[PDB]
Amino acid sequence: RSLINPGEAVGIIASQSVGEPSTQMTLNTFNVTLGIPRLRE
Amino acid sequence: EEPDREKIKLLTQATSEDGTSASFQIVEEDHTLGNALRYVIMKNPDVEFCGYSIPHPSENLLNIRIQTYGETTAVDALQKGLKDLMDLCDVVESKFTEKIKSM
Amino acid sequence: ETNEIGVPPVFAVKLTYPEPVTAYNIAELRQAVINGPDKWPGATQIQNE
Amino acid sequence: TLKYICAECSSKLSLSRTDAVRCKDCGHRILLKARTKRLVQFEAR
Amino acid sequence: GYVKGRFYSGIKPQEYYFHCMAGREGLIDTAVKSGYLQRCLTKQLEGVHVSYDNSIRDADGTLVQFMYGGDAIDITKESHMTQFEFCLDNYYALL
Amino acid sequence: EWNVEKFKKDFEVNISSLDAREANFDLINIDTSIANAFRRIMISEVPSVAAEYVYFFNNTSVIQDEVLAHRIGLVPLKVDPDMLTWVDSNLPDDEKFTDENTIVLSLNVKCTRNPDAPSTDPKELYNNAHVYARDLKFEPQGRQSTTFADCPVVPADPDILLAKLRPGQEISLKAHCILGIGGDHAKFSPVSTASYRLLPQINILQPIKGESARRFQKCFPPGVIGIDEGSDEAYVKDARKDTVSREVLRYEEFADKVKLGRVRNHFIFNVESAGAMTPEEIFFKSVRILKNKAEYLKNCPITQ
Amino acid sequence: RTADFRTLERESRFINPPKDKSAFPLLQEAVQPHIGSFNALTEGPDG
Amino acid sequence: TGQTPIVKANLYDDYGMDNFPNGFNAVVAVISYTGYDMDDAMIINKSADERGFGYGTMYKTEKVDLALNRNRGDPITQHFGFGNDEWPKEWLEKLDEDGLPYIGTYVEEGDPICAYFDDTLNKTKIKTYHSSEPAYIEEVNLIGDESNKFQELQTVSIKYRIRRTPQIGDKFSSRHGQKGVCSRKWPTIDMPFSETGIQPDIIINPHAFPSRMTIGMFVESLAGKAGALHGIAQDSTPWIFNEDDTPADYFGEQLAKAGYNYHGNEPMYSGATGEELRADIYVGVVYYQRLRHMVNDKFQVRSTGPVNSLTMQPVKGRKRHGGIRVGEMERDALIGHGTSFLLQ
Amino acid sequence: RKDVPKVEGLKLEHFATGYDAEDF
Amino acid sequence: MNRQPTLHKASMMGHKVRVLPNEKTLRLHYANTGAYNADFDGDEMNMHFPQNENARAEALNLANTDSQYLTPTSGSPVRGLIQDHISAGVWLTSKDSFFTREQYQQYIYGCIRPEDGHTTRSKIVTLPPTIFKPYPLWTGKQIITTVLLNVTPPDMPGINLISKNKIKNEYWGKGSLENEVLFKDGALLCGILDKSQYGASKYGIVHSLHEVYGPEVAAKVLSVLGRLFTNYITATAFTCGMDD
Amino acid sequence: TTCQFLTKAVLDNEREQLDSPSARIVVGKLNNVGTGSFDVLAKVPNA
Amino acid sequence: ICGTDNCPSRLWRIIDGRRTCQYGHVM
Amino acid sequence: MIVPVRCFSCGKVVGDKWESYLNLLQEDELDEGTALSRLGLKRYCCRRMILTHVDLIEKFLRYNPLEKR
Ligand SMILES: [Zn+2]
Ligand SMILES: [Zn+2]
């Protein structure tokens, strides 16, 4: 009863699930590339 | 003469089959009468549960729920509440007139 | 309610739904038609068959 | 009573058609339209 | 830049100037700094959905995944699915 | 067990000061729900007379029409209600305003110049420079212009400044004063301030006699704490005079040796009038409104 | 004994606008780089 | 209604800022009571608003120039006033014989703001007033056309007075950067009432201060109260006070001396139940400023309005009965819910 | 550092509802 | 309802229209604040009115707000009470909070109205007092028990949950267990209620109710608690000052 | 690069099967995701 | 003049947002 | 502009006490506090009403387009 329904736009949901919380990492470092620049790479 | 029916209404969607419990809806009223009326209704030994609720400030409504024990309907408990509040006000008006003269 | 939105009466008198008239809703829509476009719940227009 | 107030000398002088848009008393090119007796309804709120 | 002063007692003029530099720096970063990143993903993934054969298929029918996360579970459901003690205490309620 | 006759046995009234404008009375052994009801009615529900429709003919003053109209509405009129009937809003203006429903107040002031030696005073330099509430002339019309013969319509406070003018400016208006309630607008509230304060209670747990008694006495207003002697304990002379500043509790020597509470049954009402009705009349009408509200519901059909 | 507001001083100045040096020189000192800059366009040394 | 701050830096007088008041001194209670005030929303007293508290007006000027088409001294077909034989019904209610409007007249969108006659069309036309906000005429100025004079003055500057009472949405702020929109105009009977008998003009929610850390407002509250009672303005110039000489202790002593609570609190009662509230509420006098912006200046509604010829889609423009754009992100969201008919 | 000067002769200017400045 | 930028589908939900007289602004409940990422700082929202039943059904059953209690990003809640209600709850559910029969019944009907379909028993059921002698008194926690007793189905048993609080036991004095949130057969027997219980926080009371009784009941509990704390903040206010 | 992708489409003599959300929006067809992932048929009694 | 089966009667009235015939119909 | 009619907070008439307040400060030479007390303003809300009043109307009136100079 916990199965994903056929028709569910998992594509948009995935990009929204990566996009929306990547707004919270707009701030700079407090060596390796982090946040949005690394996600862009 | 014509009696206005919009002022007091019985919410049949909440009224008990027995009639011991009912939700009444009064228009153009709030805390002023509301809290004073539920206080007087609560002094009744037959009233089990009583409270008042204002659905929303923008809409001119006042809801008063009266749940009683047996041998008395909620309508009777409301009628007793109004009858007692009137007498209570007479006591206040009588004592104030007397103390004005007593000065 | 947490599932509701408070709509100002300004929007309520402009935003309309095309409700087809039937036997089950003739009473509800007759009132809306009488009320007109400035009295809520009213109706701004009527589409004939 | 037709009115027009001068902006400079404050003289109340009205002028009709085919006339220079200037005060008679002094050479001023700006004229304030005066308030005449007319009903304006208001709510004291 | 070490401020010994508090906002209740006040900040010494020397301390206050230092604080202002810190405050302004916080403000500029918000103004200067996910729109295009999300737009690029959504345009390529819009079609990707769950098929009636439980597999993750693109708009054109091409298979992307054979099963969502390898188990076909809706994330908005996968919460109390490991909360076994909870489910046990509410056996008859959930049954 | 509570009876309405058992309430009559315990309920007391105490009048401290009853002036022509403000009355300070007490309501002993009554519920908060009833005391708050009268308070709410005295402010919002007791009907009063105030200007509602200002009809301007001319206004060359610095004060905008809307502002000047609003100021006239705020000016309390020394007009007793019951003399006026309630206006009906559905019928048109020609049928709406009658000699029984409306009171007319006119204002006609024109400013000019006066010759005087010159900082110079505005009453000396100009004529009719300051427009006061006393300049609102009462105009009785219709069927009854004899009912207000021994009762002229005059503002409660005449020296109220309404407008300031310079020569050339003029104010010409006809204000229509009607009957309204304080809930609709604050201009209709017959009371300046109708509020109650609960009787302060000072529960002395320890005798606290000696020099600490003199220290305890300074924590409360002068006429509150009274000391018998060095001993004989420290008593409360007049707990009513207390400001409830809690000054006694911000001292380690008294923080645990005293408690600060109230008498939930005792209410100290203070009612000041705008000038139309006496403070007693305002309280009496408040009790009469609460009774009438309960009476109207009693003789009413319970629909559905 | 305090850092009070001028009430009597204020209202008198409202009715009587000074005929001498204007009050609040700091207000004119605020526009000093603007007026001064334009003043130096004709007035001052070397025309 | 401009007011002089009780709490102020002495440099306020040095710049003679009393010549231009920017706010008003209000009874502000730091209380969570109504339930409509929370983080970015604050409550204004109804009876205060009814008494003219924070009332403002907005003046807008328009230039009606008749030189719009004519150039280089061309003969003119146009002229301020009314043409003979042709006169559409009830226009004289707004404009005077000269074609200009009566100074003081109420105008709504569609009403005539001026009248003229152009010989090229041989018809009496009018320049309409159009805005969502109704106004009153404050000033009408007739201007000479220059251009070697001679020509009659068609030209004209009209000033509109738009009255602006505080509406639900309007922003209000203390001098400490604590801005909030008007959530509701709460009635005085429903408002919490003080032991003194005062109900606050403005209600600020206590949950605003822990994140913003605007303690200047907290000391302003007990300073403003002290200065209102004793009748003395207090200096709130920065770095006047020390760690040893605290303003909370300074004005606290002043508050105790007057006969109030040292920590700036006041015993308040509920407006609804009428019972005394759990603890003493923090009340004082804070200088509040009303921000000029209307809360929703961008408030719009469209059912079926005009459309562009090429796309046949609702045209852009709030006042033009324009459409709300459903962009790529909203398209993405409607795909997201798998809600194909909402997208359609 | 000089302390902020306190105000000269500050008296009580708030009392109960039905009580004036009679008590000195 | 749409609040831009629409970064995730929760920023575009379906709301039930409630026309409120004498209004000039869109009124929104505090539970929606999280999902829209909308703060009432002069924010603007778009209202779309779909014109057919298929679009209606979609906005009422798929994109409707009730199904958005948990976000699909982490399966965590995005719905809960935000400020006054959290501060009200810490005070109302405190040991020191006691209530008389008159007070207790008022708080119940104040948030639960059978006429508005808030009840599941067609009669407001009430628990006996926690103090019988000398005076009959109800505890603050008993109000929370009574609200659940009238909003959860009668056919199903009460909720059983052992959670924790944000406020450590040390703050409530010696030997207190007020950090341990305890629900036994739908009865709050230990611990106060924080942002960690009726806020948008995972494995709290609202989330626990959501899993056992469903999304419709959890929504009812949120609206009921939301009213209770608003009414409680009206009768018993909350303030902040220099003393703090 | 709308015209560039269009050129590549024309040169391929490509058939847009209208199966992507974007393509369906372009031609006003109901999106194949969620409620559009099936068809609704009515059961009729008469032969 | 509109020209619809209906008859306009002239005196067309402009409503902001809606241009309607004084009579039968509105564009 | 001019002195407001009634105190914004409670509603006590304040408009008749403006000119009288300046007379208590000028002629009587009293302090701000004692002057307000003699006018009958004990609540701090009524106190600030007159105490904090600017009276910009006197500044505004000096511009009169109806009289020369
Ligand atoms: Zn001239
Ligand atoms: Zn006041």
Instruction: Establish if J244 belongs to a structural domain.
Output: no
Tokens of J154: 């009668």
User: How many CA within 13 A on the CB side of residue J111?
Assistant: 28
d(CA F269, CA F278): 15
- Mapping DSSP to helix (H, G, I), strand (E, B) and coil, where does residue F68 land? helix
| M50 CB neighbour count, 10 Å cutoff | 24
Residue with tokens 């227009």: C45
Q: Are residues J136 and J200 in the same domain?
A: yes
Residue count (chain B): 103
Tokens of F245: 């500043």
Q: Which residue of M has its CA nearest to F170?
A: M66
| Crossing angle of the two packed helices J140-151 and J84-92, in degrees rounded to 10 | 110
CATH number of the domain at D3-45, please?
A: 2.20.28.30
Residues followed by a gap in chain E, C→N > 2.5 Å: 33
Per the structure, the count of domains in chain F is 2
CATH number of domain containing J202: 1.10.274.100
End-to-end CA distance of chain F: 34
d(CA F110, CA L8): 54
Q: Which CATH class is domain H2-55+166-306?
A: mainly beta
Neighbours of chain I (3+ CB pairs under 8 A): F, G, H, M
Which residue, J92, C32, A36, is CA-closest to E37? A36
Residue H285 vs residues B29, F44, H25, H225, M3: alpha-carbon distances, Å: 33, 26, 6, 5, 19
Q: Which amino acid belongs to residue C43?
A: A
Judge contact between B81 and B37, C-beta under 8 A: yes
Record: contact E29-A27, CB cut-off 8 A = yes
- Mapping DSSP to helix (H, G, I), strand (E, B) and coil, where does residue D40 land? strand
Which residue, J236, J207, J223, is CA-closest to J94? J236
- State the SS3 of F175-235: EEEEEECCCCCHHHCCEEEEEEEEEEEEEECCCCCCHHHHHHHCCCCCCCEEECCCCCCEE
d(CA J132, CA F300): 40
Record: contact D44-F172, CB cut-off 8 A = no
Compute the radius of gyration of chain A from its Cα atoms. Answer: 15
Cβ-proximal residues to H162 (8 Å cutoff; 6+ apart), any chain: H57, H58, H59, H60, H133, H134, H135, H136
Ligand closest to the CA atom of residue D5: 1
Residue with tokens 């020296």: F159
d(CA H130, CA H47): 33
Q: Are residues J82 and J36 in the same domain?
A: no
Judge contact between D23 and D6, C-beta under 8 A: yes
Q: Do chains H and I touch (3 or more CB pairs under 8 A)?
A: yes
| J124 CB neighbour count, 10 Å cutoff | 24
List chain M domain ranges.
1-66
Does the B1-103 domain belong in CATH 2.130.10.10?
no
| J53 CB neighbour count, 10 Å cutoff | 12
d(CA H170, CA F298): 44
Residue with tokens 């380690």: F252
Can you spell out the DSSP letters for H233-266? Answer: -EE--TTSS-SSS-HHHHHHHHHHHHTS-TTSEE
User: Would strands H202-204 and H24-32 be described as parallel, antiparallel, or unpaired?
Assistant: parallel
Tokens of F235: 């008593």
User: Was D6 annotated as part of a binding site?
Assistant: yes
* Chain G residues touching F119 at Cβ < 8 A: 12, 15-16
| CA–centroid distance, residue D12 to ligand 1 (Å) | 9
Record: contact M54-G10, CB cut-off 8 A = yes
d(CA F73, CA E48): 68
Q: Judge if the upstream peptide bond of residue J157 is cis by omega within 30 degrees of 0.
A: no
**Can you name the CATH fold of M1-66?**
Arc Repressor Mutant, subunit A (1.10.10)
- Mapping DSSP to helix (H, G, I), strand (E, B) and coil, where does residue E20 land? helix
Residue with tokens 């929007």: C11
Question: Which structural domain, as residue segments, surrounds residue F108?
Answer: 48-186
Q: Chain-centre distance of CA C5, in angstroms?
A: 17
Q: Which residue of K has its CA nearest to E48?
A: K33
Option in B14, B25, B58 nearest J21 (CB): B58
Record: contact I13-H197, CB cut-off 8 A = no
User: Was D22 annotated as part of a binding site?
Assistant: no
Record: contact F270-I19, CB cut-off 8 A = no
Q: Are residues F35 and F82 in the same domain?
A: no
d(CA H267, CA H197): 10
Residue J187 vs residues H193, J127, J159, J198, J202: alpha-carbon distances, Å: 37, 10, 8, 15, 20
Judge contact between J48 and H324, C-beta under 8 A: yes
CATH number of domain containing J22: 2.40.40.20
Q: Which of F186, F215, F246 is the last residue of a domain?
A: F186
- Mapping DSSP to helix (H, G, I), strand (E, B) and coil, where does residue E34 land? coil
Record: contact I18-F241, CB cut-off 8 A = no
Tokens of J235: 């009768």
User: Would strands F22-28 and F12-18 be described as parallel, antiparallel, or unpaired?
Assistant: antiparallel
Cβ-proximal residues to C39 (8 Å cutoff; 6+ apart), any chain: none
Q: Which residues of H are known to be catalytic?
A: 40
Q: Are residues J121 and J102 in the same domain?
A: yes
User: Would strands H112-118 and H123-128 be described as parallel, antiparallel, or unpaired?
Assistant: antiparallel
- Mapping DSSP to helix (H, G, I), strand (E, B) and coil, where does residue F57 land? strand
**Can you name the CATH fold of H1-1+56-165?**
OB fold (Dihydrolipoamide Acetyltransferase, E2P) (2.40.50)
CB contact burial L4-16 (16+ within 10 A = b; e otherwise): eeeeeeeeeeeee
What phi and psi, each to the nearest 5 degrees, are found at residue C45?
A: -155, 160
Q: Which of J24, J44, J68 is the last residue of a domain?
A: J68
User: Was L11 annotated as part of a binding site?
Assistant: no
Cited resolution, angstroms: 4.4
User: How many CA within 13 A on the CB side of residue H237?
Assistant: 12
Q: Do chains E and K touch (3 or more CB pairs under 8 A)?
A: yes
| J130 CB neighbour count, 10 Å cutoff | 14
d(CA H225, CA H254): 9
Tokens of F213: 């008694």
Judge contact between F181 and F207, C-beta under 8 A: no
d(CA C15, CA C38): 11
d(CA F170, CA F162): 13
**What are the beta bridge partners of residue F127?**
F112
Per the structure, the count of domains in chain J is 2
Which residue, H33, H26, H31, H34, is CA-closest to H51? H26
CATH number of domain containing F41: 3.30.1360.10
Q: E strand or H helix at K24, and its extent?
A: helix K21-26
Q: E strand or H helix at H13, and its extent?
A: helix H11-14
Question: Which structural domain, as residue segments, surrounds residue J184?
Answer: 69-239
Elucidation method: cryo-EM
Distance from CA of B96 to the nearest CA of F (A): 6
Judge contact between B55 and B63, C-beta under 8 A: yes
* Chain A residues touching H337 at Cβ < 8 A: 9
Tokens of H226: 């002290």
Neighbours of chain G (3+ CB pairs under 8 A): F, H, I, M
Q: Judge if the upstream peptide bond of residue C41 is cis by omega within 30 degrees of 0.
A: yes
Q: Judge if the upstream peptide bond of residue J134 is cis by omega within 30 degrees of 0.
A: yes
d(CA F45, CA F39): 10
Compute the radius of gyration of chain B from its Cα atoms. Answer: 16
Compute the radius of gyration of chain K from its Cα atoms. Answer: 17
Which residue, F286, F281, F279, F282, is CA-closest to F19? F279
Q: Are residues J93 and J170 in the same domain?
A: yes
Q: Is C47 exposed, middle or buried (0-12, 13-18, 19+ CB in 10 A)?
A: exposed
Q: Give just the sign of the alpha carbon dihedral F276, F278, F281, F283.
A: positive
